[PDB]
């Protein structure tokens, strides 16, 4: 993955997002609710050391609320946990895209609001063009007001 | 769905296809092994009359063998089954792009080799551009060779 966000600023990424769109290099890591990689960004809290607490929920035959937090690197815009958080683009206001790296890459395109935002879901097709993806998943706007988009 | 192979020629698609990628609008149409929608071409076989016999395989905790007929319409590019199969695109010697609708659609492209064709999955990209497609999944060339592309 040869792509980051130049000039992040973290703090600027605080607060609700949505999971619109998720891909990874393996059907597995997304298939089902209770694969891996399947987790939804409900807030993004970038602490004042500038770490980046994550609030996500999981599928483990409950919908789980799940706190983690992702260590600031000498790079802006990579993270580690625990395992990687690369920050590719995001405009602030709107969209975010991010990949997670073991290789098993897992991408999303979070977005602000819970809405198809046609033009970040092009952003997002434009830079997993270049990498591996076997499954790709989207969900609607009902989808994203509910625990687990069920 | 407002995509249909003008011409097409019912005969020159016999014989040999590998499902190399599968979208549905829905994603438990495609999210299991045991899916609906998860099924995989092994052959087609036009019947003299102008019908198609499909060869596929189906997980249901067994890889199982399966024989369809898909009847002909008044238009040579749209097939019925038991649910209707449209024929998009075709080249006859490298790939075949079809959806199948009931709306819960679901689109492969069909190639002829166990090979990524990067052609051919662009054209299914863009024939899926207008449609409400919610899961993408691809298959490598190993994964082409066995029963069910475990
Ligand atoms: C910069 C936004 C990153 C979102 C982080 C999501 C990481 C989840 C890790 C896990 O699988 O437990
Ligand atoms: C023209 C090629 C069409 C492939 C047909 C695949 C239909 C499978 C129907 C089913 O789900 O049982």
Known sequence: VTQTMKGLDIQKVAGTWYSLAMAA??????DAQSAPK???????????????????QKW??????????????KIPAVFKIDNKVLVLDTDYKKYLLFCMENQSLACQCLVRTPEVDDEALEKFDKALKALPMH??????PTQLEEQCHI
């Open 25 to 30: 290099s393996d059907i597995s890591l997304l």
């Open 60 to 73: 483990e035959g409950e919908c789980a609320q799940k706190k983690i937090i992702a260590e600031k690197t």
């Open 38 to 56: 399947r987790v939804y960004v409900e807030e993004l809290k970038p602490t004042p050391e500038g770490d980046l607490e994550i609030l996500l």
């Open 135 to 140: 499954i790709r998943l989207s969900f609607n």
